[PDB]
Amino acid sequence: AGEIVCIQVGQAGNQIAGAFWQKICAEHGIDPVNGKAIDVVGDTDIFFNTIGDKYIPRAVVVDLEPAVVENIREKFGTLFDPKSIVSGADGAGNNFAIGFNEHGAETLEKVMQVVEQRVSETESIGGFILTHSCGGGTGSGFGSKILKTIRERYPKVPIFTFSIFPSPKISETVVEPYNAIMTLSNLIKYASCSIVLDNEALFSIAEKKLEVENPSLEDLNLIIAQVLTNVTASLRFSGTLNLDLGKLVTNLVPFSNLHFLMASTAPLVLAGKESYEKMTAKELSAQVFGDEYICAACKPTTGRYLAASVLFRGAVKTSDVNEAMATVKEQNSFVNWIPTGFKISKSETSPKDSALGVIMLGNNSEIVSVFERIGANFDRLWSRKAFAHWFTDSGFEEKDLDDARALVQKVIDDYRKLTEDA
Amino acid sequence: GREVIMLHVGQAGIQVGAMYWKQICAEHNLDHNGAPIGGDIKGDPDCFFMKASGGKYVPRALLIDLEPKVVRQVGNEQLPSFFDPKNLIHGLYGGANSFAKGYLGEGRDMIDNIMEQLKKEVAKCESLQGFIMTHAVGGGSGGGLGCLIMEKIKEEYPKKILWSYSILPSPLLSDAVVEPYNAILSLDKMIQYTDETVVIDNHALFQIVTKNMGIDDPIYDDLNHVISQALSDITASLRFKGSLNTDMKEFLVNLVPYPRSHFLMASFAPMATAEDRQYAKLTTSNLANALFEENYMMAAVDVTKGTFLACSLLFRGENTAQDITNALLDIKGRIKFSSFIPTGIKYGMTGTAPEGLERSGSALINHTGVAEIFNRILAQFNLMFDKGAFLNWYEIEGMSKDDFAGARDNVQKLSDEYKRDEE
Numbered sequence: 145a146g147e148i149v150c151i152q153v154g155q156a157g158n159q160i161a162g163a164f165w166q167k168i169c170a171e172h173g174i175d176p177v178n179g180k181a182i183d184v185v186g187d188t189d190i191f192f193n194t195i196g197d198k199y200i201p202r203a204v205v206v207d208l209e210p211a212v213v214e215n216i217r218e219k220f221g222t223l224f225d226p227k228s229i230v231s232g233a234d235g236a237g238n239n240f241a242i243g244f245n246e247h248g249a250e251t252l253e254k255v256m257q258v259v260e261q262r263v264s265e266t267e268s269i270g271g272f273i274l275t276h277s278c279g280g281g282t283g284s285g286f287g288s289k290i291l292k293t294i295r296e297r298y299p300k301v302p303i304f305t306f307s308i309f310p311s312p313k314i315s316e317t318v319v320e321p322y323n324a325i326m327t328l329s330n331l332i333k334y335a336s337c338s339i340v341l342d343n344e345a346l347f348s349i350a351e352k353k354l355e356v357e358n359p360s361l362e363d364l365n366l367i368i369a370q371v372l373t374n375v376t377a378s379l380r381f382s383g384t385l386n387l388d389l390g391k392l393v394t395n396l397v398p399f400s401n402l403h404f405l406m407a408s409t410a411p412l413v414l415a416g417k418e419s420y421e422k423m424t425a426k427e428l429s430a431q432v433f434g435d436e437y438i439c440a441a442c443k444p445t446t447g448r449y450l451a452a453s454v455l456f457r458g459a460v461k462t463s464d465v466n467e468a469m470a471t472v473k474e475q476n477s478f479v480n481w482i483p484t485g486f487k488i489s490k491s492e493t494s495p496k497d498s499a500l501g502v503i504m505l506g507n508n509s510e511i512v513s514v515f516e517r518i519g520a521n522f523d524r525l526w527s528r529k530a531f532a533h534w535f536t537d538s539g540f541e542e543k544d545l546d547d548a549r550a551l552v553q554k555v556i557d558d559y560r561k562l563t564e565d566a
Numbered sequence: 567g568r569e570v571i572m573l574h575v576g577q578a579g580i581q582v583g584a585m586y587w588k589q590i591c592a593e594h595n596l597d598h599n600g601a602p603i604g605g606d607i608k609g610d611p612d613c614f615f616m617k618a619s620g621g622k623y624v625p626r627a628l629l630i631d632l633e634p635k636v637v638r639q640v641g642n643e644q645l646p647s648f649f650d651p652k653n654l655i656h657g658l659y660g661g662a663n664s665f666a667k668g669y670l671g672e673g674r675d676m677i678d679n680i681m682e683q684l685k686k687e688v689a690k691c692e693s694l695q696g697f698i699m700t701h702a703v704g705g706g707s708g709g710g711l712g713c714l715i716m717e718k719i720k721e722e723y724p725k726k727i728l729w730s731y732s733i734l735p736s737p738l739l740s741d742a743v744v745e746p747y748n749a750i751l752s753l754d755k756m757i758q759y760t761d762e763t764v765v766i767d768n769h770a771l772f773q774i775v776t777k778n779m780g781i782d783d784p785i786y787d788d789l790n791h792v793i794s795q796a797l798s799d800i801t802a803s804l805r806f807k808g809s810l811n812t813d814m815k816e817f818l819v820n821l822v823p824y825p826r827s828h829f830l831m832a833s834f835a836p837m838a839t840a841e842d843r844q845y846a847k848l849t850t851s852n853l854a855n856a857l858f859e860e861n862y863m864m865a866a867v868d869v870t871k872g873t874f875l876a877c878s879l880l881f882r883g884e885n886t887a888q889d890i891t892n893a894l895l896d897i898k899g900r901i902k903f904s905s906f907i908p909t910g911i912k913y914g915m916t917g918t919a920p921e922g923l924e925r926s927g928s929a930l931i932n933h934t935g936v937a938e939i940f941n942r943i944l945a946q947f948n949l950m951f952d953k954g955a956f957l958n959w960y961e962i963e964g965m966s967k968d969d970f971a972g973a974r975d976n977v978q979k980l981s982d983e984y985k986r987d988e989e
């Protein structure tokens with residue numbers, strides 16, 4: 145009855161999802177790893193299967209990396225069912241095209257057999273959630289053939305994705321553009337929605353608000369986990385609006401091809417628990433809609449929103465919420481006068497480690513600045529070498545990159561047009 | 567027979583129904599669970615229940631939804647074993663705020679089981695009078711299946727009367743950004759297929775809960791208390807022996823002067839109570855006045871400014887006929903009635919009462935101000951449709967721009983027809 149199959153792909157997918165699963169277990173009263181029913185609450189069935197005296201995360205674990213993801217065997221153990229972990233003969237590098245070549249089909253089918261089992265055990269599929277990085281051979285090199293194959297076999301089932309864009313820093317493999325743009329191509333083309341999380345944003349948040357001297361990758365993952373956990377919460381703990389995954393897709397994406405969403409959450413709390421967390425609704429709303437906390441690094445205080453929704457998690461006064469949200473509506477503005485464009489909902493379960501938390505999602509046209517950065521990497525690469533010179537043997541042909549950039553430009557341009565027309 | 571079959575479609579439909587059925591049970595002194603009879607049965611339970619040989623009364627109702635949750639929880643937990651278990655019908659995937667799915671997508675297959683099971687239900691009636699459907703307008707299954715079901719009922723049962731009681735998309739409490747699209751598509755279908763319909767606006771309902779009942783922060787569960795009590799008075803005349811309205815067939819004569827202008831607004835009073843003061847204002851004239859005041863009207867329209875096309879006031883309880891009659895003198899003349907419709911205010915009274923009230927009443931008002939409601943929805947429709955927003959969620963299932971345009975035009979013509987009667 146509307147259950148969700150979760151797909152984790154590549155190193156990023158697994159570390160991030162790991163953090164997610166621990167937190168979601170806590171909220172529903174399931175001990176992590178030894179998944180026993182310690183006073184289980186909420187609509188548990190959406191994300192966990194129940195066998196009896198056990199709760200099994202409904203997850204598919206994918207890693208092209210050779211051998212097995214012991215990183216799960218050792219860190220989570222019995223949290224994940226081993227029959228759901230898929231790997232092949234060898235791994236991949238940081239090149240998207242390797243995920244797409246050298247007999248990757250053996251693992252694509254094995255991944256799909258697992259998916260078929262998580263789907264067939266489920267009475268009804270309410271969607272898929274796919275978490276992956278955009279910068280490497282598995283995160284997107286394999287993750288995008290998954291995204292494509294899923295829509296081919298489950299055409300009416302919405303795919304909501306969370307994806308990580310690499311830091312503009314070039315410390316990573318310099319073939320990143322070739323990955324990033326092919327990744328966007330398939331996300332624009334096949335996903336129903338996606339949350340764009342930019343490591344630059346996570347990084348600057350960690351430096352500036354969470355007081356982290358030199359944020360490590362493992363710290364950034366906690367911001368992500370908190371966003372995933374809270375964003376997903378509206379699907380787990382029934383609140384004042386009857387939302388589900390399919391409905392979220394419909395409310396935030398008015399046009400095809402403009403489905404990239406920003407996300408923000410507050411208070412943002414790391415595992416150190418350095419500060420006491422109590423805020424009023426007014427303070428909390430002003431922060432979640434400020435530029436300071438936007439995970440896409442886009443400054444959506446200067447552009448305009450096309451659709452948006454806010455969930456308050458915890459006990460908050462309705463009077464204060466409405467005044468706080470009135471203040472927000474005067475501080476920014478919304479496009480094509482979608483009269484119904486902004487939604488507010490509430491749900492009483494407190495997210496742990498906080499008195500009151502807030503989730504904000506939005507479709508905002510400043511999101512294209514992420515896409516402008518990716519395009520910029522292409523324009524520099526191709527103004528110097530318009531040859532796809534990293535793809536002269538087993539890579540993609542120019543025509544594939546032609547497709548990819550064409551599609552990316554339509555996204556950028558349509559956002560710009562819709563905003564200016566209103 | 568003179569039996570009535572109720573359909574409840576979609577979440578709002580099913581939850582409002584569940585409350586209706588609890589209350590109707592109380593009125594007949596029939597127990598909630600197992601539908602037992604507390605010895606002494608009141609009224610005429612045959613209007614809404616079937617009589618089992620074991621004495622069980624089984625409500626003639628179908629709970630229908632695409633999402634297999636609301637059907638399950640009402641039929642197995644909120645009123646366990648009350649509803650006939652074969653009349654609980656559900657799909658496997660919900661719609662998602664999309665008329666198109668409920669009407670043309672999943673739902674178009676399901677409709678064969680819906681209609682076959684209805685056929686089994688009508689076949690149990692000695693003589694069926696009509697169907698009454700309760701549903702959200704702007705939802706997925708509500709709008710979509712509701713309209714699909716309505717079309718099929720009229721084709722299958724052309725001579726029975728089809729009423730609908732439905733909830734309009736106020737922007738104040740909405741689960742769907744596309745709600746206005748679904749609303750104009752649904753309203754179009756209703757104009758072409760129902761014989762009478764009652765329009766409740768959640769905006770108004772919110773205002774009532776907020777200010778008359780004194781309940782801060784209304785949630786859907788509060789709005790549904792107001793709905794359920796209003797709905798209980800509307801069909802009361804079919805449950806107890808009385809004058810005025812005594813059959814769905816009379817409703818269609820007194821309240822619908824034109825075959826295409828059958829949308830009714832409704833009022834209900836006293837809105838239970840404040841839990842202080844008194845259970846009801848007992849002055850007959852205060853009750854009579856209340857039914858024409860803006861605070862008891864679930865449409866959010868001041869009926870003072872406009873033209874009444876029809877009015878029927880059903881009073882319940884201890885009210886004296888002569889006092890009502892005197893009360894009406896200060897109402898006619900405050901309000902205007904159409905020059906082309908000789909009918910004045912019709913009223914009468916059934917000598918029973920909702921549990922806990924000395925007297926109460928409700929009114930069905932056919933009035934030109936209904937157009938304001940349609941015009942708010944149409945304004946939203948127009949801003950969104952003209953930029954193509956969200957149209958891809960409908961075209962993907964087969965509903966193109968031409969159907970949207972058709973629905974828009976028919977609803978606009980309805981609004982224009984009512985506007986002419988203001989002169």
Ligand SMILES: Nc1nc2c(ncn2[C@@H]2O[C@H](COP(=O)(O)OP(=O)(O)OP(=O)(O)O)[C@@H](O)[C@H]2O)c(=O)[nH]1
Pocket residue numbers: 153154155156157159160209235236237238277278279280281282283284308310311316343361364365368
């Ligand atoms: N925010 C975030 N970024 C990550 C995480 N893991 C890796 N990254 C970044 O993502 C990129 C690597 O993405 P992946 O596709 O998962 O790398 P991979 O393809 O699995 O690389 P191999 O393990 O060598 O096959 C690098 O730019 C890293 O900086 C993570 O858990 N969170």
Ligand SMILES: Nc1nc2c(ncn2[C@@H]2O[C@H](COP(=O)(O)OP(=O)(O)OP(=O)(O)O)[C@@H](O)[C@H]2O)c(=O)[nH]1
Pocket residue numbers: 386575576577578579581582632633660661662663664702703704705706707708709733734735736739740741742745768786787789790793
């Ligand atoms: N008065 C009242 N209105 C409701 C209630 N529930 C929902 N609404 C309104 O109805 C709209 C949609 O209602 P739904 O009942 O969810 O329609 P649905 O068919 O269940 O929608 P799907 O779940 O997509 O099939 C909401 O946006 C509100 O405007 C309710 O319990 N009472």
